[PDB]
Amino acid sequence: KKGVVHGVATVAEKTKEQVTNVGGAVVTGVTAVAQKTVEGAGSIAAATGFVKKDQ
Amino acid sequence: KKGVVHGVATVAEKTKEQVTNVGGAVVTGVTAVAQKTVEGAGSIAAATGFVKKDQ
Amino acid sequence: KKGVVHGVATVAEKTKEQVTNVGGAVVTGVTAVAQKTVEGAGSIAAATGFVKKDQ
Amino acid sequence: KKGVVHGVATVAEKTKEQVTNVGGAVVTGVTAVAQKTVEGAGSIAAATGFVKKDQ
Amino acid sequence: KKGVVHGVATVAEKTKEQVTNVGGAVVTGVTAVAQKTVEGAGSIAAATGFVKKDQ
Amino acid sequence: KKGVVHGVATVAEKTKEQVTNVGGAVVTGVTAVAQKTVEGAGSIAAATGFVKKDQ
Amino acid sequence: KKGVVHGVATVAEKTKEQVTNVGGAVVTGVTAVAQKTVEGAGSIAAATGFVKKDQ
Amino acid sequence: KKGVVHGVATVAEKTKEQVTNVGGAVVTGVTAVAQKTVEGAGSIAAATGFVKKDQ
Amino acid sequence: KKGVVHGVATVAEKTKEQVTNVGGAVVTGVTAVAQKTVEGAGSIAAATGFVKKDQ
Amino acid sequence: KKGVVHGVATVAEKTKEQVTNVGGAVVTGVTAVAQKTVEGAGSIAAATGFVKKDQ
């Protein structure tokens, strides 16, 4: 076989899960957050996949 | 087989799940948030997939 | 087989779920949010798939 | 088989769900939000798939 | 076989999970956060995959 | 002060919430159930406060 | 002060929450269930407060 | 002070939370269940407070 | 002071939390369950407070 | 002071937490279970407080 990509690719066979991202956010997984009190200014309480590039 | 992509591709066979994103947000997964009190200015309480690029 | 894409594609066979996004938001998954009080100015309380690019 | 796309495509066979988006928003999944009080100016309380690009 | 990529690629066969990211965040895994009180200004309470590049 | 009860009482001062039950069911709290498929004969899918005394 | 009870009482002062139960079920708390598939005969999927006394 | 109870009592002062139960179930706490697939006959998947006295 | 109980009592002062139970189940605490697949016949997957007295 | 109990009592002063149980189950503590696959017939996967007296 032959393949040429510029990116971003994701090429496969017999594949149970696939995610391609440029951005941006993708949530595909099981996630449970239980929480009782959030205070403070300002605290990232429960972050799973996170990116902060403030300018 | 032969394939040429510019991106972003996601090419496969026999594949249970697929996500392609440029952006942007995609939520495809099970997610449960239970929460009782959020305060503060300003706190990211429960973030799963998150991207902040303020300018 | 042969395939040429510019992107964004999502090409497959025998595939249970598919999402293609450029944008933008796509919500296809099970999601439960239970919440009792949100305060503060301004706090992202419960974000699952999120993108903030304010200019 | 043969396929050439410009994007955004989503090509498949035997496929239970499909979403193609350029935009924009698509909601196809089960979603339950229960909520008791939202205050503050201005707090994104419960966001599932979200994109904010204010200029 | 032959392959030439510019990156970022992810090329495979017989592959159970795949993630390609440029960004950005991708959450595909099981995650449980249980939490009782978050205070302080400002403390990253529970971060799993995290990136902070404030300027 | 003086108090004599037979039960069931609930006596208080300065009290934000109160529930008295003999029975029976009382639901006063925030509750979010999101659900996609229930099968089987017969499975209690999502029970929060539950009592089964079949004879 | 003086108090005589037969039960079940709940006597207090300056008290934020109170529950008295004989039964029976009382749900006063925040609860989020997100769920995607329930099968089997018969499986208690997600039980929070539960009592089964079948005869 | 003086107190005589038969039970079940719960007597206090300056008390943030109170639960009295004879039964029966009481759910007053924050709870998040996220779940993707339940099978089998019959499996208690996610039980928090649970009592099974089948006869 | 003087106190005579038959049980079950719970007598206190200046007390943040109280639970009295005869039964039965009481859930007052923060709880997060995230789960992806439950199979088998029949397996207690995730049990927090649990009592099984089948006859 | 004077006290006579039959049991089960729990008598105190200046006390942050209290639990009295006859039964039965009480869950008052923070608990996080994250889990990916449960199989087998039948295996107690993750048990925190547990009692099995099958007859």
Side-chain angles (χ1 to χ4, degrees):
Chain A
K1 71 181 74 173
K2 187 175 180 180
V4 170
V5 317
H6 185 276
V8 316
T10 300
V11 186
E13 186 184 0
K14 292 287 184 68
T15 290
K16 185 179 288 186
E17 296 180 1
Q18 280 170 351
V19 168
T20 301
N21 187 0
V22 171
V26 169
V27 175
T28 320
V30 177
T31 296
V33 176
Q35 198 157 358
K36 176 74 74 73
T37 298
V38 180
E39 298 182 357
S43 66
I44 297 68
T48 300
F50 196 93
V51 175
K52 255 203 47 161
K53 323 248 206 176
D54 284 326
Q55 279 197 11
Chain B
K1 71 181 74 173
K2 187 175 180 180
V4 170
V5 317
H6 185 276
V8 316
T10 300
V11 186
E13 186 184 0
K14 292 287 184 68
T15 290
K16 185 179 288 186
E17 296 180 1
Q18 280 170 351
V19 168
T20 301
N21 187 0
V22 171
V26 169
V27 175
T28 320
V30 177
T31 297
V33 176
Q35 198 157 358
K36 176 74 74 73
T37 298
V38 180
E39 298 181 357
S43 66
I44 297 68
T48 300
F50 196 93
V51 175
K52 255 203 47 161
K53 323 248 206 176
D54 284 326
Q55 279 197 12
Chain C
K1 71 181 74 173
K2 187 175 180 180
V4 170
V5 317
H6 185 276
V8 316
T10 300
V11 186
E13 186 183 0
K14 292 287 184 69
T15 290
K16 185 179 288 186
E17 296 180 1
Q18 280 170 351
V19 168
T20 301
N21 188 0
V22 171
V26 169
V27 175
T28 320
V30 177
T31 296
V33 176
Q35 198 157 358
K36 176 74 74 73
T37 298
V38 180
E39 298 182 357
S43 66
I44 297 68
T48 300
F50 196 93
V51 175
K52 255 203 47 161
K53 323 248 206 176
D54 284 326
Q55 279 197 11
Chain D
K1 71 181 74 173
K2 187 175 180 180
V4 170
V5 317
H6 185 276
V8 316
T10 300
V11 186
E13 186 184 0
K14 292 287 184 68
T15 290
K16 185 179 288 186
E17 296 180 1
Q18 280 170 351
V19 168
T20 301
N21 187 0
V22 171
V26 169
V27 175
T28 320
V30 177
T31 296
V33 176
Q35 198 157 358
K36 176 74 74 73
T37 298
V38 180
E39 298 182 357
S43 66
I44 297 68
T48 300
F50 196 93
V51 175
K52 255 203 47 161
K53 323 248 206 176
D54 284 326
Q55 279 197 12
Chain E
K1 71 181 74 173
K2 187 175 180 180
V4 170
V5 317
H6 185 276
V8 316
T10 300
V11 186
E13 186 184 0
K14 292 287 184 69
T15 290
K16 185 179 288 186
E17 296 180 0
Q18 280 170 351
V19 168
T20 301
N21 188 0
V22 171
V26 169
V27 175
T28 320
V30 177
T31 296
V33 176
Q35 198 157 358
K36 176 74 74 73
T37 298
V38 180
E39 298 182 357
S43 66
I44 297 68
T48 300
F50 196 93
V51 175
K52 255 203 47 161
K53 323 248 206 176
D54 284 326
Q55 279 197 11
Chain F
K1 71 181 74 173
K2 187 175 180 180
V4 170
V5 317
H6 185 276
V8 316
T10 300
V11 186
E13 186 184 0
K14 292 287 184 69
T15 290
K16 185 179 288 186
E17 296 180 1
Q18 280 170 351
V19 168
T20 301
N21 188 0
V22 171
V26 169
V27 175
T28 320
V30 177
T31 296
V33 176
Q35 198 157 358
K36 176 74 74 73
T37 298
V38 180
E39 298 182 357
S43 66
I44 297 68
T48 300
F50 196 93
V51 175
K52 255 203 47 161
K53 323 248 206 176
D54 284 326
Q55 279 197 12
Chain G
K1 71 181 74 173
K2 187 175 180 180
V4 170
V5 317
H6 185 276
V8 316
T10 300
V11 186
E13 186 183 0
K14 292 287 184 68
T15 290
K16 185 179 288 186
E17 296 180 1
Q18 280 170 351
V19 168
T20 301
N21 187 0
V22 171
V26 169
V27 175
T28 320
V30 177
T31 297
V33 176
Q35 198 157 358
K36 176 74 74 73
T37 298
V38 180
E39 298 182 357
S43 66
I44 297 68
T48 300
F50 196 93
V51 175
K52 255 203 47 161
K53 323 248 206 176
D54 284 326
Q55 279 197 12
Chain H
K1 71 181 74 173
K2 187 175 180 180
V4 170
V5 317
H6 185 276
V8 316
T10 300
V11 186
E13 186 183 0
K14 292 287 184 68
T15 290
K16 185 179 288 186
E17 296 180 1
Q18 280 170 351
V19 168
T20 301
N21 188 0
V22 171
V26 169
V27 175
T28 320
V30 177
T31 297
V33 176
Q35 198 157 358
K36 176 74 74 73
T37 298
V38 180
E39 298 182 357
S43 66
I44 297 68
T48 300
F50 196 93
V51 175
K52 255 203 47 161
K53 323 248 206 176
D54 284 326
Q55 279 197 12
Chain I
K1 71 181 74 173
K2 187 175 180 180
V4 170
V5 317
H6 185 276
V8 316
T10 300
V11 186
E13 186 184 0
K14 292 287 184 68
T15 290
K16 185 179 288 186
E17 296 180 1
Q18 280 170 351
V19 167
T20 301
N21 188 0
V22 171
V26 169
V27 175
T28 320
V30 177
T31 296
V33 176
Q35 198 157 358
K36 176 74 74 73
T37 298
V38 180
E39 298 181 357
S43 66
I44 297 68
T48 300
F50 196 93
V51 175
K52 255 203 47 161
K53 323 248 206 176
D54 284 326
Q55 279 197 11
Chain J
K1 71 181 74 173
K2 187 175 180 180
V4 170
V5 317
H6 185 276
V8 316
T10 300
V11 186
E13 186 184 0
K14 292 287 184 69
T15 290
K16 185 179 288 186
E17 296 180 1
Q18 280 170 351
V19 168
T20 301
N21 188 0
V22 171
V26 169
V27 175
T28 320
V30 177
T31 297
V33 176
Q35 198 157 358
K36 176 74 74 73
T37 298
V38 180
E39 298 182 357
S43 66
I44 297 68
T48 300
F50 196 93
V51 175
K52 255 203 47 161
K53 323 248 206 176
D54 284 326
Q55 279 197 11

